[PDB]
Design a protein around this ligand. Structure first.
Ligand SMILES: CC#CCn1cc(N(CC2CC2)c2nc(C(N)=O)c(-c3cc(C(=O)N(C)C)c[nH]3)s2)cn1
Length: 296
């Protein structure tokens, strides 16, 4: 923190583009009264064997005293494209482009979800706030997952969670979170809730897949059913009571890649978390799709 110069506001806490010896970094800055949120996110990022090409690259947790108040810093790799939300608003994608964004997101989530067993292993982690606004797009057109502050970690020996857990973004909350039926002592239930949210993100990507000049406008999931900044009650009435999901355009049946993406979405969107695909199964499916004749 001592040797980083903040240059530009780029969106708990606030995010800046900084320079460390002339190299661009991203800095999320918290106030003294946000220490618990800063510490918890620092803790998640310092998890043994967390580093992965599809998880935002951690550089440091640090303090900076400006002479009046102390700032709490989280420093990461800088990605010029910023959030998948901003990227999908600005650009359309090719079939290959769509699969790369979806596969890289699934690979990041499969890694978070995966317990790497050992005396020195990585615990399984559930994100609990996955959305297009906290996935970043790298220069190579792959995604990495950020904003890990609400994550929960699994102790597989006792089947317990490392903290005492409706915390995340209301629009992306799983049906079982919206109606508060989720078993918050059951780690597997948090993994299944992440899959529902990733299905919504896949729908946002697929809309922007342009074939023969044809694509949908960028929209958030449920743009057609709830107000901007929706309440838990507004979301619950649509997702749980009326049992609606984002609409699958008829266009997506014209293309094998979009057909497979649409099938993944419906198998992420079941009301019962136990019925949903795993991140690893989605990663396997999109890996196979990426190499298919007519796609590759
Ligand atoms: C460990 C750690 C850490 C730091 N950290 C940083 C974030 N967030 C916020 C985001 C996840 C919600 C971000 N990171 C980056 C980045 N890495 O380039 C962001 C970015 C925005 C733009 C951009 O929009 N423009 C226009 C340059 C370009 N890049 S926005 C969260 N935590």
């Amino acid at each position: 923190a001592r040797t980083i110069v903040l240059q530009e506001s780029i969106g708990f806490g606030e995010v800046w583009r900084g320079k460390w010896r002339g190299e661009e970094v991203a800095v999320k800055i918290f106030s003294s009264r946000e220490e618990r949120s800063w510490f918890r996110e620092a803790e998640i990022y310092q998890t043994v064997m967390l580093r992965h090409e599809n998880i935002l690259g951690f550089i440091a947790a640090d303090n900076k005293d400006n002479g009046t108040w102390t700032q709490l810093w989280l420093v990461s790799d800088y990605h010029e494209h910023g959030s998948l939300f901003d990227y999908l608003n600005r650009y359309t994608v090719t079939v290959e482009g769509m699969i790369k964004l979806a596969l890289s997101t699934a690979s990041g989530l499969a890694h978070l979800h995966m317990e790497i067993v050992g005396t020195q292993g990585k615990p399984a982690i559930a994100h609990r706030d996955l959305k297009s606004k906290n996935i970043l797009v790298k220069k190579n057109g792959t995604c990495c997952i950020a904003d890990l502050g609400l994550a929960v970690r699994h102790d597989s020996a006792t089947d317990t969670i490392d903290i005492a857990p409706r915390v995340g973004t209301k629009r992306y909350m799983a049906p079982e979170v919206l109606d508060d039926s989720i078993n918050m002592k059951h780690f597997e239930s948090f993994k299944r809730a992440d899959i529902y949210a990733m299905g919504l993100v896949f729908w946002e990507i697929a809309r922007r897949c342009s074939i023969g000049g044809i694509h949908e406008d960028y929209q958030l999931p449920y743009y057609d059913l709830v107000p901007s900044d929706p309440s838990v009650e507004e979301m619950r009435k649509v997702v749980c009571e009326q049992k609606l999901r984002p609409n699958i355009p008829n266009r997506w049946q014209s293309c094998e890649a979009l057909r497979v993406m649409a099938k993944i979405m419906r198998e992420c969107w079941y009301a019962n978390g136990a019925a949903r695909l795993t991140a690893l199964r989605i990663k396997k499916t999109l890996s196979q799709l990426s190499q298919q004749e007519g796609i590759k």
